[PDB]
Structure 1
Amino acid sequence: SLSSEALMRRAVSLVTDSTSTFLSQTTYALIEAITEYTKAVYTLTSLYRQYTSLLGKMNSEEEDEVWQVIIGARAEMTSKHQEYLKLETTWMTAVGLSEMAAEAAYQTGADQASITARNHIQLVKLQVEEVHQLSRKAETKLAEAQIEELKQKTQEEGEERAESEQEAYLRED
């Protein structure tokens, strides 16, 4: 049936159109969310570096103020991470919708509109993978800073503790 297949092609082109738009929308929203998250990681990173540069103790005021800000910054980082996870889920659904739309286009003979859709899905994936990689690069810098901070803190801890133990040893031991 010539007219039946024409109708199936038309119906699928309506699905492709609506799904492509939803994918574009969710893609940009997701990229925006990851970028907001990445900024928050960079912010938290410099704070750890500041705290570490003050370690040993000495300036007990700055040290505690910086640590207080870190607590709040961890919080902001966490909310922005959950926000992007939420959009990531929606984005995956959007990707599935488009892929199934491309498959449907294929099954009904709209091979053209199928390849086209398949290619746009690809570019959207590459795009998301790249902003994701930038975020991961930021996470690596944050982790290194957290590690250095723990390195220093545990070190200062051991030294202050060896001291107290040595002083306790001299108090008759």
Structure 2
Amino acid sequence: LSSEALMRRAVSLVTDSTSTFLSQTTYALIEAITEYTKAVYTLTSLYRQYTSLLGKMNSEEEDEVWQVIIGARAEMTSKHQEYLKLETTWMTAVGLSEMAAEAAYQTGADQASITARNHIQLVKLQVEEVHQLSRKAETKLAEAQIEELR
């Protein structure tokens, strides 16, 4: 069959396109995570300040800070929903590039496969690193909320 080298050229176009698409969803996902983490930091600060006001106090400033907390929590939940919808797209992009690395290997393009496999591993590492910053921020928020219950 003569369509072997022609299959190698087409599967290289797939690895090239899926890698581009993976970069694009990744970079969008990492932005969404960082903005969500920044919102979590802000909400955390407001809790610790609110807590600091409990004790010899009236109702104006506590209600005002709490109203800010209500807005900040809307912002945190908004940002969480944006990250979730972008996470599906990124996972589809990951799936595509994984199937493309496989197709490259099955047709003998091999070198396109390894470069795709390296790209996927790099991208999961980049995303997991900002994700771990998100988990840390979430933990400190939980700590701030527990301290507030005084």
For Structure 1 versus Structure 2, the TM-score category normalised by the shorter chain is over 0.9
| Counterpart residue number, 2:116 | 117
For residues 59 and 13 of structure 2, the distance between their equivalents in structure 1, rounded to whole angstroms, comes to 65
Which fold has the larger relative contact order, with Cα–Cα distance below 8 Å and residues 6 or more apart in sequence? 2
In structure 1, runs of 5+ residues without a counterpart are 151-173
Report the number of matched residues. Answer: 149
| Counterpart residue number, 2:35 | 36
For residues 149 and 57 of structure 1, the distance between their equivalents in structure 2, rounded to whole angstroms, comes to 15
Query: Could you report, residue by residue, the CA deviation over 1:10-69 in whole angstroms, capped at 9, with x for unpaired residues?
Result: 110111111000000000000000000000000000000111001146131100000011
Structure number with larger C-alpha Rg: 1
For residues 15 and 54 of structure 1, the distance between their equivalents in structure 2, rounded to whole angstroms, comes to 59
C-alpha RMSD of the superposition = 1.0
For the 8 Å contact 1:23–1:98, the answer to whether it is kept is yes
Query: Could you report, residue by residue, the CA deviation over 1:108-149 in whole angstroms, capped at 9, with x for unpaired residues?
Result: 011111111111100100110000001111111111000101
For residues 57 and 97 of structure 1, the distance between their equivalents in structure 2, rounded to whole angstroms, comes to 59
The TM-score normalised by the length of structure 1 is: 0.84
For residues 90 and 96 of structure 2, the distance between their equivalents in structure 1, rounded to whole angstroms, comes to 10
Query: Could you report, residue by residue, the CA deviation over 1:91-111 in whole angstroms, capped at 9, with x for unpaired residues?
Result: 000000000000000000111
3-state DSSP class of the match of 1:28? Answer: helix
For the 8 Å contact 1:22–1:94, the answer to whether it is kept is yes
The TM-score normalised by the length of structure 2 is: 0.96
Q: What fraction of aligned residue pairs are identical, expressed as a percent?
A: 100
CA 98–57 in structure 1, closer or farther in 2 if over 3 Å, else same: farther
3-state DSSP class of the match of 2:2? Answer: helix
For residues 58 and 19 of structure 2, the distance between their equivalents in structure 1, rounded to whole angstroms, comes to 56
| Counterpart residue number, 2:87 | 88
Moved over 4 A (4+): none
The range that moved more, 54-63 or 123-132, is 54-63
For residues 57 and 63 of structure 1, the distance between their equivalents in structure 2, rounded to whole angstroms, comes to 11
For residues 63 and 33 of structure 2, the distance between their equivalents in structure 1, rounded to whole angstroms, comes to 30
3-state DSSP class of the match of 1:32? Answer: helix
3-state DSSP class of the match of 1:57? Answer: coil
In structure 2, runs of 5+ residues without a counterpart are none
Q: How does 1:14-93 map to 2 (within 5 A)?
A: 14-56=13-55, 58-93=57-92
For the 8 Å contact 1:57–1:63, the answer to whether it is kept is no
For the 8 Å contact 1:19–1:97, the answer to whether it is kept is yes
